[PDB]
Amino acid sequence: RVSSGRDLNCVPEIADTLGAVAKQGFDFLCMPVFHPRFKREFIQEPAKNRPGPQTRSDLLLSGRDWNTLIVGKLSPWIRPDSKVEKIRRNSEAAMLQELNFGAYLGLPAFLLPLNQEDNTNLARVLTNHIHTGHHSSMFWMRVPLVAPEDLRDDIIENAPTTHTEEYSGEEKTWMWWHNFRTLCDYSKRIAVALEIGADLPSNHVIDRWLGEPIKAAILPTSIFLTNKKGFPVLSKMHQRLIFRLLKLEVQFIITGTNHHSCSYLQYLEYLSQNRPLFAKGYEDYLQSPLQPLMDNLESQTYEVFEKDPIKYSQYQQAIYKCLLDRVPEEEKDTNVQVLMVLGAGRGPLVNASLRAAKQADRRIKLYAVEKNPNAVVTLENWQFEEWGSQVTVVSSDMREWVAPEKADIIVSELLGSFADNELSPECLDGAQHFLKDDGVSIPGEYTSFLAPISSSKLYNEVRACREKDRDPEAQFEMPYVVRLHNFHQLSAPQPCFTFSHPNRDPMIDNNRYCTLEFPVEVNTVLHGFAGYFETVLYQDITLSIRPETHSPMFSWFPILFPIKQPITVREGQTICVRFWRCSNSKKVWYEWAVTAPVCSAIHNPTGRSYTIGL
Amino acid sequence: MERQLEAARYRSDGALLLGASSLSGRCWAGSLWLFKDPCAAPNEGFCSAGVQTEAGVADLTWVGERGILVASDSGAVELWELDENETLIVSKFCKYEHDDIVSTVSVLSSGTQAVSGSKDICIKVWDLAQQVVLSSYRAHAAQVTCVAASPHKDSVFLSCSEDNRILLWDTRCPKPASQIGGYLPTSLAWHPQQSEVFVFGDENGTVSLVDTKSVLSSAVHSQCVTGLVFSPHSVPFLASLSEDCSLAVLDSSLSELFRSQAHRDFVRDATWSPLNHSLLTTVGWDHQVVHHVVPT
Numbered sequence: 001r002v003s004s005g006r007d008l009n010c011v012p013e014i015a016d017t018l019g020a021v022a023k024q025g026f027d028f029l030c031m032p033v034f035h036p037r038f039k040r041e042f043i044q045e046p047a048k049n050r051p052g053p054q055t056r057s058d059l060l061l062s063g064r065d066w067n068t069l070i071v072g073k074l075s076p077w078i079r080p081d082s083k084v085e086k087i088r089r090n091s092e093a094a095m096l097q098e099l100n101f102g103a104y105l106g107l108p109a110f111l112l113p114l115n116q117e118d119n120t121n122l123a124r125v126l127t128n129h130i131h132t133g134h135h136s137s138m139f140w141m142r143v144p145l146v147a148p149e150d151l152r153d154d155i156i157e158n159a160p161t162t163h164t165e166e167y168s169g170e171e172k173t174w175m176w177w178h179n180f181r182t183l184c185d186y187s188k189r190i191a192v193a194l195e196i197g198a199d200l201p202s203n204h205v206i207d208r209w210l211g212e213p214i215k216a217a218i219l220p221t222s223i224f225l226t227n228k229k230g231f232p233v234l235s236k237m238h239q240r241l242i243f244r245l246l247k248l249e250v251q252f253i254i255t256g257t258n259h260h261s262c263s264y265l266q267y268l269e270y271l272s273q274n275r276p277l278f279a280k281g282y283e284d285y286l287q288s289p290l291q292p293l294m295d296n297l298e299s300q301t302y303e304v305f306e307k308d309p310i311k312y313s314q315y316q317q318a319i320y321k322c323l324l325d326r327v328p329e330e331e332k333d334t335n336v337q338v339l340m341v342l343g344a345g346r347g348p349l350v351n352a353s354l355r356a357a358k359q360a361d362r363r364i365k366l367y368a369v370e371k372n373p374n375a376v377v378t379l380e381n382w383q384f385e386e387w388g389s390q391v392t393v394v395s396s397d398m399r400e401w402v403a404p405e406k407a408d409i410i411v412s413e414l415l416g417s418f419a420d421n422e423l424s425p426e427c428l429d430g431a432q433h434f435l436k437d438d439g440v441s442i443p444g445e446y447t448s449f450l451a452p453i454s455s456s457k458l459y460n461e462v463r464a465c466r467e468k469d470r471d472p473e474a475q476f477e478m479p480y481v482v483r484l485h486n487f488h489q490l491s492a493p494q495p496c497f498t499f500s501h502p503n504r505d506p507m508i509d510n511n512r513y514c515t516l517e518f519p520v521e522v523n524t525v526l527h528g529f530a531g532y533f534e535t536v537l538y539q540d541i542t543l544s545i546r547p548e549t550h551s552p553m554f555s556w557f558p559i560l561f562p563i564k565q566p567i568t569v570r571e572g573q574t575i576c577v578r579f580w581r582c583s584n585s586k587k588v589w590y591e592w593a594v595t596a597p598v599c600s601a602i603h604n605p606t607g608r609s610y611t612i613g614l
Numbered sequence: 615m616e617r618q619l620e621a622a623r624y625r626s627d628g629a630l631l632l633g634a635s636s637l638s639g640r641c642w643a644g645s646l647w648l649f650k651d652p653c654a655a656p657n658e659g660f661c662s663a664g665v666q667t668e669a670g671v672a673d674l675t676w677v678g679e680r681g682i683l684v685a686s687d688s689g690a691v692e693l694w695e696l697d698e699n700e701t702l703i704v705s706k707f708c709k710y711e712h713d714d715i716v717s718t719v720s721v722l723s724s725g726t727q728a729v730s731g732s733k734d735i736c737i738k739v740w741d742l743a744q745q746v747v748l749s750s751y752r753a754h755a756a757q758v759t760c761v762a763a764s765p766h767k768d769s770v771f772l773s774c775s776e777d778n779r780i781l782l783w784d785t786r787c788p789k790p791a792s793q794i795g796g797y798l799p800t801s802l803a804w805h806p807q808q809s810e811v812f813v814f815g816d817e818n819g820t821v822s823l824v825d826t827k828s829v830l831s832s833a834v835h836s837q838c839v840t841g842l843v844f845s846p847h848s849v850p851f852l853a854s855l856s857e858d859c860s861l862a863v864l865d866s867s868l869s870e871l872f873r874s875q876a877h878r879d880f881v882r883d884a885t886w887s888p889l890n891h892s893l894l895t896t897v898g899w900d901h902q903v904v905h906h907v908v909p910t
């Protein structure tokens with residue numbers, strides 16, 4: 001199912017037109033609220049006194065139709081940025097008129113075109129309208145992938161078309177959009193309606209729209225080819241672009257006349273159902289990173305942890321291999337290893353430890369240390385009905401537990417999306433004293449990774465996270481767990497912080513300071529840094545949410561460190577970021593800053609906005 | 615009959631062709647009329663012929679003595695023809711080749727080919743006999759505002775667009791468009807007796823006299839210049855209509871001779887009488903059909 005709409009500039013009667021548009025399969029109809037050629041005068045007489053009605057009556061469609069089927073269009077003669085003062089004024093009054101009428105009808109969206117560079121006054125008038133109350137209308141800016149001046153036929157004798165590549169010049173229409181919404185101050189009610197032409201530009205021109213709030217894609221009937229049967233199709237390149245749009249779930253709009261004397265619509269449906277799913281629904285949904293140390297996780301939270309068999313089969317294998325390497329065959333019925341699950345939750349690692357023992361044909365004694373008393377309930381009902389004397393549930397903080405003996409292996413799952421963001425280093429450090437001098441730690445090490453990303457959509461979402469009683473910018477000085485979706489990765493991820501266990505170093509200091517330099521090969525806007533992690537469970541057994549090496553594991557989502565102000569980056573420039581892992585005896589926190597190509601502010605100084613509870 | 619009077623053209627004998635649009639209300643349509651008695655217009659009860667079009671009439675022009683070429687809001691070019699009795703206006707063909715409102719149309723000298731402009735930014739050359747588009751051009755980078763065929767050269771015609779380009783066309787060349795050397799141009803008019811000279815009005819209300827080789831101007835109107843029509847005299851007069859609801863008659867040097875303000879709304883068209891050259895008809899969205907007597 002593809003949500004599509006019909007664009008028109010000729011509507012003899014909304015009753016009929018809307019009927020044919022529906023019977024063909026269109027979900028909604030874009031059309032002008034006033035006659036497109038019905039130019040109106042607002043200052044000079046006698047034209048200003050033109051008796052009404054100034055347009056159609058709202059009584060021609062039920063309230064529900066105006067709210068769900070009709071998308072308004074700005075009349076094409078309105079030029080708020082015209083060079084003639086008289087024309088600006090008339091256009092200003094007419095734009096407000098049609099905008100106010102669209103709201104009067106409760107239209108779900110209203111279309112305005114971006115077809116030249118300077119739209120300053122257009123944005124002002126729209127901004128003033130948007131600030132005439134807190135209403136729920138949407139404004140789709142119609143901007144072309146390629147400016148009309150850059151796709152015209154060369155057929156002008158004394159005005160030959162450009163024949164030398166202009167890298168930035170070919171991205172001009174994005175600059176049109178960027179400036180418009182920067183003037184409008186990133187209003188959540190202003191989205192993009194990307195218009196596609198018969199000829200697609202370079203890839204870098206198309207990639208420029210990654211992370212932008214694309215709500216609709218406009219497809220003129222002219223760009224459609226014709227197969228043997230005589231039906232409209234699309235070049236393989238256009239098909240590829242359409243697939244990039246389906247992942248954004250945009251509403252495709254069909255404009256122009258029928259040059260194949262609903263076929264166009266059927267082709268889109270044919271394309272949608274032709275393509276190959278777990279996190280569906282969490283796309284770009286900002287969440288607070290879990291803090292299992294400071295907070296006690298809820299039952300269903302542990303349920304999600306346990307709904308990932310590939311993750312614990314990796315734990316089982318890591319334990320399977322470790323047991324073999326420690327218990328020689330000549331000691332399989334005499335050597336019992338002491339395994340301590342530090343953070344057992346509801347008992348997944350405990351069961352993984354058991355199955356790894358029968359697999360390695362060795363003997364083990366299990367301790368299940370868990371500080372969450374609610375989960376300890378699950379473990380002890382599990383221990384009474386099933387496990388038994390083999391498992392010793394310990395309801396304590398691993399940093400305070402006075403162990404009766406020492407462990408040959410300690411297994412923990414204290415890692416977050418940013419590796420150490422749940423304070424696994426501080427916990428495994430404290431739990432280190434009761435580790436035998438030759439004891440193994442699973443995981444044995446872990447590393448965090450960062451990557452500069454561009455996504456005006458996600459930037460606005462963080463912007464909307466202001467709250468009544470806290471710093472007005474605190475939403476930018478804290479990380480968010482999010483299934484990153486509509487964004488642009490600007491450089492290959494690089495390693496940030498790494499920790500090893502057991503940590504034998506004489507000066508155990510978990511604070512960190514790292515400087516990263518990301519080459520950027522595109523013009524873009526930096527909005528934040530995505531964060532991932534990798535971990536070595538034992539040897540070659542590993543887990544990773546890092547994209548290039550992702551464990552083929554539905555668990556961790558990526559983390560996101562935003563920045564207060566977007567940072568423009570030119571192709572070839574280097575993004576230099578600074579990340580700190582700070583701490584006192586009470587809390588641990590990150591501080592980050594950008595130092596190139598421009599310095600940002602140090603984010604979250606002294607954990608004023610975000611701390612991790614110890 | 616619709617309220618917004620769009621076009622008005624006299625033919626050889628003297629009949630008046632009216633193209634109207636419904637630019638507001640329930641139905642946004644249009645119609646075509648023929649008043650063998652020009653004084654009866656726009657009264658529908660005393661007309662020679664009429665027929666309703668599906669959409670509005672953005673522009674039109676005669677195609678001989680019984681042909682009517684129309685540019686429709688629907689994006690199609692239309693050809694209507696009077697019967698042998700000139701009492702019925704029957705549609706000859708309706709081709710939807712443009713992807714937006716057809717804003718301007720004009721017949722070429724031979725009366726067998728026409729050029730159409732459209733808000734889709736395209737200009738197309740039409741073969742009226744075969745009812746097909748010979749060529750399809752995309753020279754401008756914005757809405758095409760006006761296209762006017764050469765009065766005597768069947769392969770030359772002008773066109774202006776909101777890209778601020780005035781283009782001289784000669785389909786005899788590999789690159790058939792030439793850019794002719796301000797404010798956006800909105801109306802084009804070839805000179806009746808020079809062929810290499812034309813005039814054009816802008817959105818700022820200025821009318822200019824331009825010669826083929828590489829300039830005289832004058833502030834005529836207070837708003838957009840919607841149309842320009844030369845009179846049939848030996849040394850023609852220049853009539854200019856504007857959104858300022860005024861009609862002006864200029865001389866050779868672009869000096870004002872006549873000034874009419876009868877209209878109470880936009881003045882959309884103006885046509886000279888082939889029977890009396892001192893009479894000039896005008897129509898407007900106020901639904902008026904005024905007959906002016908221009909002093910000579």
Ligand SMILES: CSC[C@H]1O[C@@H](n2cnc3c(N)ncnc32)[C@H](O)[C@@H]1O
Pocket residue numbers: 292293296297305342343344345346369370371372375396397398399413414427
């Ligand atoms: C699998 S998510 C992390 C689990 O480890 C537990 N955990 C985290 N920190 C500690 C700690 N210091 N001592 C004991 N259990 C802990 C949490 O309560 C949760 O069950």
Ligand SMILES: NCc1n[nH]c(=O)c2ccccc12
Pocket residue numbers: 290292304305306308311413414415416417422555556557
């Ligand atoms: N230790 C935290 C954690 N552990 N295991 C998971 O599967 C998971 C998934 C999402 C978020 C956090 C987690």
Ligand SMILES: [Cl-]
Pocket residue numbers: 286287288465
């Ligand atoms: Cl949140």
Ligand code: NA
Pocket residue numbers: 028068108109
């Ligand atoms: Na919609």
